[PDB]
Structure formats: C-alpha cells, structure tokens
Amino acid sequence: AADCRGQSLASVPSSLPPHARMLTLDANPLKTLWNHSLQPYPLLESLSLHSCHLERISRGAFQEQGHLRSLVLGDNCLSENYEETAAALHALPGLRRLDLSGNALTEDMAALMLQNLSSLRSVSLAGNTIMRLDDSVFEGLERLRELDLQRNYIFEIEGGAFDGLAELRHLNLAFNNLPCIVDFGLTRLRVLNVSYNVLEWFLATGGEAAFELETLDLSHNQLLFFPLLPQYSKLRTLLLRDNNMGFYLADLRFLDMSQNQFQYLPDGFLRKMPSLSHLNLHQNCLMTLHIREHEPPGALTELDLSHNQLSELHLAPGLASCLGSLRLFNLSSNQLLGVPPGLFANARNITTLDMSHNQISLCPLPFRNMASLRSLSLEGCGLGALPDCPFQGTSLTYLDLSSNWGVLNGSLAPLQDVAPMLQVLSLR
Amino acid sequence: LSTCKTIDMELVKRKRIEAIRGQILSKLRLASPPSQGEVPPGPLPEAVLALYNSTRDRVADYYAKEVTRVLMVETHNEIYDKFKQSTHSIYMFFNTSELREAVPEPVLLSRAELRLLRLKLKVEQHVELYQKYSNNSWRYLSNRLLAPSDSPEWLSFDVTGVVRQWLSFRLSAHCSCDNRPFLLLMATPLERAQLDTNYCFSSTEKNCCVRQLYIDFRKDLGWKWIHEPKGYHANFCLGPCPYIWSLDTQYSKVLALYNQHNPGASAAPCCVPQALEPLPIVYYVGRKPKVEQLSNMIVRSCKCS
Amino acid sequence: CKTIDMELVKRKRIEAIRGQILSKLRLASPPSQGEVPPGPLPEAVLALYNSTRDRVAADYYAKEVTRVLMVETHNEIYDKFKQSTHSIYMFFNTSELREAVPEPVLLSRAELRLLRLKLKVEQHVELYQKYSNNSWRYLSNRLLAPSDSPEWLSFDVTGVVRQWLSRGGEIEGFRLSAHCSCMNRPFLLLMATPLERAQHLYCFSSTEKNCCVRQLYIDFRKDLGWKWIHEPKGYHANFCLGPCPYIWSLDTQYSKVLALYNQHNPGASAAPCCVPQALEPLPIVYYVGRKPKVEQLSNMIVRSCKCS
Ligand SMILES: *[C@@H]1O[C@H](CO)[C@@H](O[C@@H]2O[C@H](CO)[C@@H](O[C@@H]3O[C@H](CO)[C@@H](O)[C@H](O)[C@@H]3O)[C@H](O)[C@H]2NC(C)=O)[C@H](O)[C@H]1NC(C)=O
Ligand SMILES: *[C@@H]1O[C@H](CO)[C@@H](O[C@@H]2O[C@H](CO)[C@@H](O[C@@H]3O[C@H](CO)[C@@H](O)[C@H](O)[C@@H]3O)[C@H](O)[C@H]2NC(C)=O)[C@H](O)[C@H]1NC(C)=O
Ligand SMILES: *[C@@H]1O[C@H](CO)[C@@H](O[C@@H]2O[C@H](CO)[C@@H](O[C@@H]3O[C@H](CO)[C@@H](O)[C@H](O)[C@@H]3O)[C@H](O)[C@H]2NC(C)=O)[C@H](O)[C@H]1NC(C)=O
Ligand SMILES: *[C@@H]1O[C@H](CO)[C@@H](O[C@@H]2O[C@H](CO)[C@@H](O[C@@H]3O[C@H](CO)[C@@H](O)[C@H](O)[C@@H]3O)[C@H](O)[C@H]2NC(C)=O)[C@H](O)[C@H]1NC(C)=O
Ligand SMILES: *[C@@H]1O[C@H](CO)[C@@H](O[C@@H]2O[C@H](CO)[C@@H](O[C@@H]3O[C@H](CO)[C@@H](O)[C@H](O)[C@@H]3O)[C@H](O)[C@H]2NC(C)=O)[C@H](O)[C@H]1NC(C)=O
Ligand SMILES: *[C@@H]1O[C@H](CO)[C@@H](O)[C@H](O[C@@H]2O[C@H](CO)[C@@H](O)[C@H](O)[C@H]2NC(C)=O)[C@H]1NC(C)=O
Ligand SMILES: *[C@@H]1O[C@H](CO)[C@@H](O[C@@H]2O[C@H](CO)[C@@H](O)[C@H](O)[C@H]2NC(C)=O)[C@H](O)[C@H]1NC(C)=O
C-alpha cells in the first residue's frame, strides 16, 4: 500500500488511491471533518491521528464506511464532547482497538464514551483526567481485552467495579494515586504493573481460588509490612523495589526488594519459597545474616548485595553443603573484616566473584577449586595481594586491580600465569 | 480492584464538631465551661455591643487575645487652647493611667489600631500620620490615601510600632515649598501570660521544620542548559506534626510554629510553607538569550496546618 | 536505617522540582548546546544577574525582566526644567519602554532602582511624578537607615509605568528633590511576558472536585450545645478538601497539560495537602466572673485554599 505522512494543505487531501489499506497522518493541523468527502472508498481499516487536534465531528460520519478495524486518537483535545455527539462514534461494532490518549476524558465523558458494544478491545486512557470509576460506566464492555490506565488519578473505586469481565490479562494503572487496595475481585488476571503509586497498606484477601497472575509489581510504594499473597502458587516474577517495610507460592523465581530496611529475616519467609532463580536485596541496612535453614537462599542465578554493612556472614559450623549453585555474587560497600572459609570451598559453579569495597583479609595458607573464572576484581581488598602466587590451575579472564594500594612493588608476581589468557583488563 | 472507605462519606460529614470543639478548647485554654448559671437574666451591656460593632466591620499569637477600646479625650483640658484648629487638624494624646490599667506590660501588647472620621471626600486628598515624640518637633511614619465614598468607613493605622514604648499624634496636610475617634487595643490577658532554617539545622528536632537538601544541575536532575546559578539550596520541610492539645507541650519555641494549624478546616494535619524567596533562572534560546525571574520557589519557613 | 527515608525524600523533592521546571518553561526540552558559543558570559547578562540578585530595600505565569537606562545630562535634559540648588531626576524614553514592553496591558510588575552614596546621618526620601507640564503627582513615602554598605533601593511603580505605557506622551519623568518642612546610573526592571509565551496568542459557585471550598454553617444552640455564648449565634466555618494529584516529570509534554499541572500543582510539594492560606479572625464574647471580656480568635475564616 501507500500513504502520505506529514503533508497538509487542506482538511481532506481527496487524492488517496482507491482500495487503500495504510493511512498515517502526523503533524497535520486538521480543522473540521465532514460526512460527504470522508467516504471515497469503503475499504479503510487502518488509521492514525496524532498531532491532529480537531473538534467539529459530524456525529458518526463512519456509518457509510464498510467496516472499521483499528482506532487511535493522539493530541486531540476533547473537552466539550457532551453536546457534540453521543459517545464519539457509532461505526460497525467490529472494533478491535480504540485509544483515547491525551484527550482529558472526564466522568461524564467516560460515561458517554463506553456504550452497548461488547466488542470494544484495547482501550487506552493514557494522559486523561479520570477521578473515579463507577459500576454504570463499564456496562456493555463484557470483554475489555487490553487495558492502559496510565496517568490517571484514581483515588476512589466502587466495591466490585470490575464485574462481569473476564479477559483482564493486562492491567497497567501506572502513575496513579490510590491509597489502599485490599480486595481482588478479578478472576482472570496475568500481569499487575502497579508502580510509581502511593500505597499505604496491602491486605489482599485469600481463599481456595488459585489466582493465576504471573506478575506482581509494587514499586515506589509506602507500605509498612510485608504484603502477604494468597495461598496460590501461580506466580513467576515480583517487584518490590523502592519500598519501606518495618519488621517490628512455589513457582516464584524472581525477587527484587532493594532499598529496604531489612533488619531481621524470618525462617519461614525463606523456607516457604522453593525453586527460586533470582534475588535482589542490595542497598539495605542489614546487619545479621545468620544461616540455619536447610536451603535459605536455595538456588540462585544472580545475587546483588551492594551497599550492605553486615558484620559477618557464616554458613554453619557443620552445614551439609552451603549452596547448590551460584552464578553472580555482586556485593559492594561492605565491612567484612573476616573471611568465611566455607563460602567458596563448596562448589565449582561460581562464575563472577567481585569483592568490591569488601576489605578481604584471606589467610595465606599456601583459589584452588572452581577453576571456571570469568570475572574478578580486587577493589578495596585491604591487605596487599598474597606473598606467593595465587590462582593455581584456574583460568582467569577478567581482572580489575583498581584502587588496590597494597603490596605491588611493580613485580607483577600475581600476573604470571594469567597474562596469556585475558579478554579485557583495566586498573586504576 | 477496590479501595477502602478512605475518608468515608459518613466521616466527612462528622467529626468536624469535635475538631472545632477541641480547637476552641485549646485556644481558650478552658477545658470546661467556667460556671453554669449565676448570670444576669437581661440584655447584654450596650458597651459590649458597641465594641463588637466597632471591631466587626472591615477596614500571630496562637492563644486568644483580649480586645480593649479606649475612648477619645473630649478635647477639654488645659492644653486645648494651644491648638485652635487652624490649618491643622488637631489631635490629642490619651490618659496614661488607663493605658497602664488596660495593658499591664508592653510585652503582653501586640498591636493596636487608631480610627478617624471621614465624611465628605469631595477632593482627592491624602492623610498624614504623625507621632508626638516632642512638643516642638515630630517625625513621619506612613501615609494613607482615601477614595471617595458617601458612607463613612473606619480606617486603621500602624501605631503598633510606637505604642509599645509609650510607658511614661497630630493630623496635618502636605505643604508645597515651590462616634468618637477611639483607639483599639488588642492586648493579652494576664491569666494567659507565660523562622530561619539554620536554627533547626543546628539542633535536630522531630517536629515540622526545614531539613537540608542540595540540588545541582549536573546529575541529580539530568540536564545542563541552566547556566546560572549552578548550585543553590532548594530545601524542603517534613515532620510528623502532632495535635497541640493532646501533647500539651506548652513551650515558647513549640507554640510559635502553630500559626497555621487548623485540623478542622484542612481535614488532615500537614506542613505547608508560608513565606518563600524568588529565584532568577538563566537559559539560552533564540538569538538573544533572556533571563526569567521566578518568585515563590525556595521555602524558608514551614509550619503545620 | 535512618538514611533511606531521607534519600527517598531527597529524590522525591528533586523530582518535584524537575517537574515544576519542566512545566514552568511551558515548552519541550530545549537543546542545551544549540548553536550559541560556549564563550564567556557577556556584560549584559551578568549585569542583569547582579541587578536581580541583590536584596530589595496569573501571578504564576512566566515573568521576564528587561533593562533600560537613562541618558546622560545634556541640553535636552537642561532645556525644559533645570536644578536651582538640589535636584535629582531620572527619566527614560517612552520608545524604549515600548520596545521593551510591547503591550501596556502585558506589563505586570515594575521596580525602580537607585544608587545612594550612603554617607549621611539623616535623610528623608520623597517620590514625585510629572503628571502634567506644570504639575506633579503625589507618590509613596518611605524611610532610610544610616547604613555603611551601599545598596540599591526598590520602589513599587507598577501603576505609573502602566499609565505611561497606556499614554502616548513623548517624554516624561520623576522628581525627587528634598524634605522641605514648613557608569553606575540608576537601574530599571520591568516584569512582563513574551508574546510567544502567552496562552491566547469561581469554583465555589460551580461543582468541582478540586481543592475548593464550599458552605457550612454551625451554631451554638443544637449541634454544638454551648449555652454560655450569647453572641454570635453562628458563623461560616467553611472547610475545603482536595486530592491534589501529583504529576511525574517526563521529557515530552502536551499543551493543555501545562495548565493542568498549573492547577494540580502550583508549588510542587512532596506531599501536597489542600490547606488554607489566607485566614481572617473573628471575635466572640462571654461573661465570666464580675467583668465582661471580649477576645478575637484568629485563623477562623477561610477564603481560598491551595496545596503548594
Ligand atoms: C452528516 O451526519 C448528520 C448527522 O447529524 C446528518 O444530519 C442529518 O441529516 C438527515 C438528512 O439526511 C436529517 O434527517 C432529516 O430530518 C428532517 C426532520 O428534522 C426530515 O424532515 C427530513 O426528511 C430528514 O429525514 C437529520 O435530521 C440530520 N440530523 C441532525 C440535523 O441532527 C447529515 O445530513 C450528514 N451529512 C451528509 C449525509 O452529507
Ligand atoms: C444499548 O441498547 C440496548 C438495547 O436497546 C439498551 O439497553 C436496554 O435498556 C433497557 C432499559 O434499561 C432494558 O430494558 C429492561 O429490561 C429488563 C429485562 O428484564 C426489564 O426488567 C426492565 O424493566 C427494562 O425494561 C433492556 O433490557 C436493555 N437491552 C439490552 C440489550 O441490554 C440501551 O439503549 C443501550 N445500553 C445498554 C447498557 O444496553
Ligand atoms: C510497567 O510500567 C512502567 C512505567 O509505566 C514501565 O516502565 C518502562 O520501562 C522501560 C524500560 O523497561 C522504559 O524505557 C526506557 O526509556 C528510556 C528513555 O526514556 C531509555 O533511556 C531506557 O533505556 C528505557 O528504554 C520506559 O520509559 C518505562 N516507562 C514507560 C511508561 O514505558 C514498564 O515497562 C511496565 N511493565 C512492566 C514493569 O512489566
Ligand atoms: C554490582 O552492582 C553495582 C550496583 O548495583 C554496580 O555498580 C554500578 O556500576 C556502574 C558502572 O561502574 C555504574 O554506572 C555508572 O553510572 C555513572 C552515573 O551515576 C556514570 O557516570 C558512569 O559512567 C557509569 O556508567 C553504576 O552507577 C553503579 N551502580 C550504582 C548503584 O552506583 C556494579 O558495577 C556491579 N558489579 C558488577 C561486577 O557487575
Ligand atoms: C487618668 O485615669 C486615672 C484613673 O482613673 C485618673 O485618676 C483619677 O483621678 C480622679 C480625679 O480626676 C480621682 O478622683 C479623686 O480621688 C480623690 C482620692 O482621694 C478624691 O479625694 C477626690 O474627691 C476625687 O474623687 C480618682 O481617685 C483617680 N483614680 C485613681 C485610681 O486614683 C486620672 O485623673 C486620669 N487622668 C486625667 C488627666 O483625668
Ligand atoms: C532617547 O531619546 C533621546 C531624546 O531625548 C534621543 O536622542 C535618543 O536617541 C534617539 O533615538 C534613535 C533611536 O531610534 C537614535 O538612533 C538617535 O540617536 C536619536 N534620534 C533622534 C531623532 O534624535 C533616544 N534613545 C533611544 C530611542 O534609544
Ligand atoms: C450593634 O449593631 C447591631 C446591628 O448592626 C444593632 O442592632 C440593631 O439595633 C437597632 C437599634 O439602634 C435596631 O433598630 C435593629 O433592629 C438592630 N438590628 C439587629 C439585627 O439586632 C445594635 O444596636 C448595635 N449596638 C450598639 C450598641 O449600637
């Protein structure tokens, strides 16, 4: 197909070829449309109106069109639509998408916009003035497949607002200000992107119904206690960053709970979580890291522990194995005076190990195992290198001797059996 | 997806009576009414009604402040003959003993107003304020301009800076070289007688004051077209402000930060700034760059509400 | 763990300032580099900054300041009226004001700056305006302080500058002579808004859900039950509430969203609350003991409230 994008001379070009399929119009200062030149061909299905502010609508000019497939409005200032026409348009009920981005929909406008047409799908309200949602505003919207509730200030919700709606896989009401949500009446939800919102408690009800939502987001939320989830075990990822918790489900495999006030960790909180794959608990004011559970981290693929002022970490005097597997062991801004002996001599699956700002004072007993080195740094190690040659029988590729200030003497003794095997090297 | 009762449709209608009752109780300091009965079963005194009418028409200490009216001298004394009302609108001072009786100490006194008569207003004129420091010489304090009006209206003045030290006025017109006029006293009863940011920077307090903050246009905000100023202190204010009557601190420093506190009207205790300072912003655009003058930007004093 | 909430408030406040500025310029993100040279600042801009930095001695819209100067003494100045013994005059071209401020109604604020030797024990200042050819107009009167560090005084001359812009006079000026009982020329600052920055180039009466105030009337008879207060029977104890929504700062912006922010966030506070600003007192009377007493209670009457 073909189209003209960026050219504007009049209201209607009236020069598009017949049986067209593509039509894109941007930066077009349209003034007014009519229902006598709008239908040169009843075979239009794709359209786009962005930077195309217009108000004078002909009260449903698409009744003469064969069919409508997609709809999207951009940079259109619908402010007095109440007397212009009923709703916005009444086309063939075979709608697929409908966007209302940047139109400042109001309560009356929202009540008029949604009508007795159950085929409305992919409804977006990004950048509009929504204050409240009622029960009579969602009538005739039995499916509502795709949801976009960005930049909407929903502070009061009627009990049971989402009634008789099933296809609710996606729900992203980001950049909202709702105080508390304690009831989840949804029966079919997949992703919850509640982020950059001011929440003050989380008391979601539970029961014998196993929810199948695979994503829960609670970022930038001002909680006070851990938001316990119902007894369902259908969930794969979770985000709880930029939150405040004061300490005064087996499918889960992703954790992101940075920037918190973790002081004491309960045994059950780690015991009741089998089969993990990710974790993020850095920049937290943690001091105690006692290990007594059989599999307190369990299995991990990454670990970030930057900005942690914990005193010392120990597995156990007689622990039966320390960790099943580990790939990333990032940590920074630490004050570990002591070096745990059992942390490293457990398995050979460790790949990336960096003691940045750790002040490691490992004993010079003659490291030996886990000869699969791929990344290593010695930033702020404290004691200077090692009197004898370290890293015996280990292939090291990445080394970062930045801000060492240790025993160097310019001899480059440690850099003896690792020079021929290098990928990228940098130092201060 | 549903919310709580939040502020509730029934709670918004209620609890304002209790809030205003607590506010009146705290401001009046009386936890209970003084007495029941033992009152004259008759009309209120005419002097009280006259004072209320005088102080009601249109022209800060948290505690309740008593208002007092002083009657103007009847212009019948020894020195009356000296001023014959020629090319000068004569005015007279007051009796010092009754000023002392009304206001025991200058510290209790806060401010006062003085009122004149203003009837005809045929020609656009201007009314001079004078102060009687000496019998031979006087000084200038302020001037007031009056707009024509048939109905007389009382006007105030700025004697608050001069009546404080009066423990021991005239009316003229500019010359080119080329009811009785009472004075109002809002004193303080004897029974109820007891902000720069570095002050609470030096001493850490859990109350609502200003906390330190720095903003630089390098990486905190993410842009660089602002060239001047590079760095300034865009401070904030935050604090868990408690209820004044529940805590009952009764401290001079604490009570000075509750000049805007009003839980009943605000419906939620919060901190809001009251006085700010301007800030010029310099940026480059177009042929000739221009500078903008932004006012009401940096908070200086923040109290409760 | 006391350094986490502090940093949270720091980032919230800087985000609020960023959003306030991004809505404040009322345009998209401008190019910092552009085509202007990165060379030293010219004399004019630093002079403007020095003039706007020293302390003095619709309102939210963009205010721009311009600089105008007088002309050195010459025949034209010494032609109409001269100085006999003491006289200080400052007058400026009307065409200069017109080219600085195009429309008279477009002007908002004006300030007058003066330089004083600051070496005199006693001094008084009088302000006069040339209302006509042979008559003057009275202006405000202030005082002075015998200080030792020279500085620039400020005067409110918005009305007279508005009148001069509205009039088509060829030349006019001020007058400052004395108190008569019976390279560093004075600066000028004019606050205005560029034409391209304009928008065209209450709530109590209507029904709105924003931070506005509506009616309430309570007495001391039934709902309060205070029989010891004889007068007043009741008063308008108005209250207001408002969600005060928060705008997150983004790089792109729309047109009407500028005013939307200007109504939803006039101060860009971390935790805005719909609270009163202007308060008016009201007195009450009651009889206790053997002497009548009247006390005036402040912070009672509310007119308008906003969250900043
Ligand atoms: C564009 O759409 C508008 C819809 O608002 C069309 O206006 C409508 O036009 C029809 C005629 O085609 C009007 O029907 C007429 O009603 C009168 C009684 O008022 C009757 O006497 C006539 O015989 C005829 O049936 C209809 O009222 C009118 N709608 C209004 C005014 O709200 C407009 O014609 C369309 N433009 C076209 C088709 O070019
Ligand atoms: C969409 O078009 C439909 C169809 O014209 C309209 O909805 C209709 O609204 C009426 C009045 O509310 C309904 O009548 C009611 O029927 C029940 C059936 O028991 C009866 O008990 C009530 O007393 C009343 O008569 C009607 O059923 C309903 N039709 C449909 C298909 O829903 C309306 O114009 C548009 N809006 C909606 C939301 O349907
Ligand atoms: C849930 O909603 C949030 C916010 O509404 C979504 O966050 C979005 O995340 C993407 C990246 O994952 C951001 O794109 C970024 O753009 C900047 C330029 O502005 C670029 O420098 C970055 O490299 C990145 O590409 C995006 O801005 C951000 N916000 C939005 C509104 O899209 C998130 O994707 C949603 N879904 C989740 C969390 O599953
Ligand atoms: C372990 O995690 C920490 C943080 O979780 C990583 O520190 C991050 O390191 C990168 C690269 O050095 C930093 O990016 C830098 O950002 C500044 C602007 O702030 C920019 O000017 C630099 O050019 C650079 O791009 C990043 O800021 C820093 N994170 C924090 C929170 O400071 C660390 O790299 C991780 N270690 C490994 C081995 O992956
Ligand atoms: C300013 O106010 C004070 C207080 O009201 C006035 O003092 C009062 O002056 C009158 C005379 O003008 C005193 O009355 C006389 O009292 C003596 C007492 O022995 C009596 O013998 C006389 O027959 C006459 O009744 C009155 O006592 C006195 N008040 C007090 C409390 O001592 C003062 O006069 C006022 N100033 C002017 C200029 O009027
Ligand atoms: C200000 O007014 C004086 C008259 O007292 C005038 O001499 C100044 O310069 C005039 O304006 C012209 C600018 O348009 C300038 O180029 C020229 O020297 C002079 N014009 C005439 C006819 O004498 C005025 N200064 C201004 C307007 O900036
Ligand atoms: C104070 O003002 C009130 C009302 O402004 C006065 O009450 C009026 O008094 C007159 C008598 O002079 C009556 O004719 C009116 O009917 C009264 N009006 C009301 C509403 O009561 C009152 O008299 C004034 N007090 C004084 C001492 O002058």
Ligand SMILES: *[C@@H]1O[C@H](CO)[C@@H](O)[C@H](O)[C@H]1NC(C)=O
């Ligand atoms: C005022 O002018 C002086 C002289 O160059 C300069 O040093 C100073 O920085 C200026 N003040 C400003 C720009 O605030």
